[PDB]
Amino acid sequence: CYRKL
Amino acid sequence: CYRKL
Amino acid sequence: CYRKL
Amino acid sequence: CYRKL
Amino acid sequence: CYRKL
Amino acid sequence: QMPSLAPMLEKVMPSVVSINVEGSTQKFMALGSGVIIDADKGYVVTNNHVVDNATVIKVQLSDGRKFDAKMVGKDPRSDIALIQIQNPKNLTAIKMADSDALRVGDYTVAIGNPFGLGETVTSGIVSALGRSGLNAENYENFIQTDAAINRGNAGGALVNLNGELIGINTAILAPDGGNIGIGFAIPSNMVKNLTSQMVEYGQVKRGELGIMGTELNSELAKAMKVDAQRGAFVSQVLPNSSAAKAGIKAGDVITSLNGKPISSFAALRAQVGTMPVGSKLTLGLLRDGKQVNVNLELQQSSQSSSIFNGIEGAEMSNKGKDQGVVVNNVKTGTPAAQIGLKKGDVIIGANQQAVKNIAELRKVLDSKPSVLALNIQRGDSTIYLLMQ
Amino acid sequence: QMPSLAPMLEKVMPSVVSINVEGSTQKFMALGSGVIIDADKGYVVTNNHVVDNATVIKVQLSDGRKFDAKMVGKDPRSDIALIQIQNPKNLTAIKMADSDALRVGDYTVAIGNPFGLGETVTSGIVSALGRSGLNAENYENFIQTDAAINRGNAGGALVNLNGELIGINTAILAPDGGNIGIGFAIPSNMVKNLTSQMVEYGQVKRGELGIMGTELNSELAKAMKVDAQRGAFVSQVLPNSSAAKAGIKAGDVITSLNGKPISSFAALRAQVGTMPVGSKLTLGLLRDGKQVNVNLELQQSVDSSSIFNGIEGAEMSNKGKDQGVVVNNVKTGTPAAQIGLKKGDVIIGANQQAVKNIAELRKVLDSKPSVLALNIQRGDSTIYLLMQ
Amino acid sequence: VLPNSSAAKAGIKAGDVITSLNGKPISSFAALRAQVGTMPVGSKLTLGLLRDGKQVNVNLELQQSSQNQVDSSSIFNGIEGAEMSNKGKDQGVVVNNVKTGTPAAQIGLKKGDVIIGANQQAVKNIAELRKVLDSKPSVLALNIQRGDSTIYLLMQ
């Protein structure tokens, strides 16, 4: 699960 | 399952 | 309803 | 439903 | 299981 | 001109009866079926679990005639019971067939009283022979059939197309209490031998050969380098046993009975477990891949419910020479241990009358007094136990 | 003298076997029946729903012999699998008959192993033909029978009075898990076509004619001024398909296949779903009340779950000539869209390994790494996707 | 890396591994997320990469968010669930994200809305919006536009 900074 | 009469 | 064996 | 041959 | 005769 | 089973059935159906019984243990009522064995004497076979703990026995014929019946024998190991009609008047006996010639594929007709509706006829075929495994302690060599059989068919007849009795419908395999096409019946040859013993003695004289064993699967068959993938495997022979006197050793594999192939150990145990003492039979053995035949003769094996007719849980027999009725063993929580009697007790007398054997004792059980006083002795001590 | 079925069974029953299965998924053990198709090669047909995800498979004959068997083919769309006995020694095969000559009213004999009790035979008749609908995606042309069939009968043989294989017992209609007299079997002619592809190729070469359709009811025949009330209604013919190349137009009604009438579209669909690609057959058509016959020749015939096992909902294929795995279309809310896949992506590689097509992809899926890193590209961008 | 992103402009490629921030090693991705989520916009920092077993250092500078900049809460002091940002040059506040089951979507806010005005005052940016919410009006009449249409949404 990639999240935005 | 197994039963009598 | 329908069954297998 | 639409079935295919 | 061993049975007798 | 149409093929039908009605011509045979109008002959045999009167020989099939229904059984109404009332008893208690907490009063209950149940019902089963039965087959006229001796039309003259009034002998009707049924399942022992149909007549277990039974006070009153009423039978209704196919034609609606009512009679009264009394217990004759009972055998919970094989679930075969025999009763006798009081005042037998105008009966029709049934022909018996040789079940050892039965083949899977033969047509079968089941006759009983499912749900007390009356004599109900169903059809089927022999599903299999020698089926067993419902209760490992019973002498079970059941015949499987797709004949519709439900509660009430118990003690009913399984017959062939010529009206000959092949088996007594006994139990079914039903996950829902309703027949799914799997019924089991006790073959005639078994019931033939069992009844004949109950006719003379009221009990079955259990004779044994004195051998131990277990089932032969293909796994163990490979281990002993024996070709047969099924049969009876000889574990050991007891000393002074008929097998020891005949020449049977450990490591043998039983394959046939009187030439008739063996289906399993479980069937073979029930086969001879019902034959009367002294029955001369031949067996086929297989030791070291070499076929051997031996001839044998059964021997005696020397071993409460059968005597009270209502108090179970205590095996008892006679003692020495006119030494009373010693009780062999008692089960915990049964109608016998509920009155105090324990294993080792020796019933010497009752109600001011001495008891040398089981026959002298039942002379008081038939006297049916209001209160009973059992003068047993535990060890060298003198005690009493009271009932009713 | 009595009629009996034992003579046929004594020669045919050795052909029927019982199957014991061990697998894992939550490890499980299952049991059923099988049929020897080729005695020499040891090919044994069974139900595919019996042998799925099975690690250890042992097969026990009618006489009690145990073997180990290995998988040969499987086809869940028709529920037929083929196993091979290891060390086939002294087996008995079954002769298969032409099921397309079967008629409602023929006597049937079922053979199987209900509840692991053993080889159990029951009798019945052909209730109906062409039955389908228990699982609409499956190719089912079931024969209905009142022959008794319970849990474990699966993979068993359905034979006529001569012992020739007519069908493979598959499923029952039991709201309570016990038989009530409705068994379904897949006709032998379908089993004969489905087994023959697993012998040569190990899978089924699914062929297509290239037409859409649905069942013909009595209401539709009135609108189309068609006489026949049952059959296959041609919605359309697909371009460059075998059927289109053959002269089939929309609005036609199919009536026969190889001279044999057709029971239903869902039954006709099951027929060809078993025949190998290119089989030349004859069709009965009906356009404007005139019969037209045509010979045909199947043509050859993608999801993410076809190369995934668990992740569906994204249409994908190869790009150009060794240009990666392009994504055709994705539905928002699928196991592929749950991991971010979008329509138009171009899979370049994964885990530092280049990917030119589905074949180079499937070379690394078999390596089964713990975590996967796809090097796909969306437009001018280069992105990554992770799995497991 | 997103297009027109400082990382893309700095020379950062996908599949790389970050190891340090300003020299201080990074414990995890979630920890770095919290580090930079507090740094003021334009904060100049240095990063340490590991690509094909090669160490890389980069100078970078924080940028604003044209997507999911300002969530609803910090403006209304009680209404969450709507991430929003400015449009064009004083062309309103488009809502980037609306959460399912939150106080913002409970009044009907969807993605794509473009707020032009509210309570007879044209609204061009989040400051002009907050300039009316500090007035704390009893009821709020939003002259937003969804698509080519000009609609209204009410509050309190």
Author numbering:
A (entry chain N), D (entry chain P), E (entry chain Q): 471 to 475
B (entry chain K), C (entry chain J): 460 to 464
F (entry chain E): 11 to 35, 82 to 359, 364 to 448
G (entry chain D): 11 to 35, 82 to 357, 362 to 448
H (entry chain B): 293 to 448
What do the authors say?
First, DegP is an allosteric protease, whose activity is carefully regulated, and a hyperactive DegP variant kills bacteria. Second, because DegP is an inherently promiscuous protease that degrades misfolded proteins, over-activated DegP may destroy various proteins that mediate essential processes in the bacterial envelope, such as cell wall maintenance, membrane construction, or cell division. Previous report showed that substrate binding accompanies several allosteric behaviors of DegP: proteolytic activation, assembly of cage-like proteolytic chamber and positively cooperative binding of a substrate. DegP mainly degrades misfolded proteins, but its over-activation by the tripodal compounds triggers excessive degradation of newly synthesized proteins and leads to bacterial death.
Interestingly, activation was observed with TMB_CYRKL and TMB_CKYRKL, but not with TMB_CRKL or TMB_CKL. In particular, TMB_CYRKL increased the cleavage rate by at least ten times more than Lpp+Leu and TMB_CKYRKL. Activation was followed by inhibition at higher concentrations of compounds and maximal activation occurred at around 100 µM. The concentration-dependent activation and inhibition suggest that the tripodal compounds also bind to the active site of DegP. Alanine substitution of each residue of the pentapeptide (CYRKL) revealed that tyrosine is most important for activation. Overall DegP structures were almost identical to that of the dodecameric DegP with an active conformation (rmsd 0.697 Å and 0.986 Å, respectively, for 2309 Cα atoms in six DegP subunits). Additional electron density maps were found at positions where two degrons of 18–58 are present in the dodecamer model. Because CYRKL and CYYKI have hydrophobic C-terminal residues that can occupy both the S1 pocket of the active site and the hydrophobic pocket of PDZ1, we believe that these peptides are located in the two substrate-binding sites in the same fashion as two degrons of 18–58. Although the lack of electron density for the central benzene ring hampers determination of the binding mode, we suggest that only one arm of the tripodal compounds in the co-crystal structures binds to either substrate-binding sites of DegP, because the distances between two cysteine-Cα atoms in the CYYKI peptides of the crystal structure are too long to justify any of the three plausible modes for the bi- or tri-partite interactions. Nevertheless, the simultaneous binding of multiple arms in solution cannot be ruled out, because a slight change of peptide conformation may allow the connection of two pentapeptides to the benzylic scaffold without changing the position of the two C-terminal hydrophobic residues. Taken together, the crystal structures suggest that the tripodal compounds mainly bind to the substrate-binding sites of DegP.
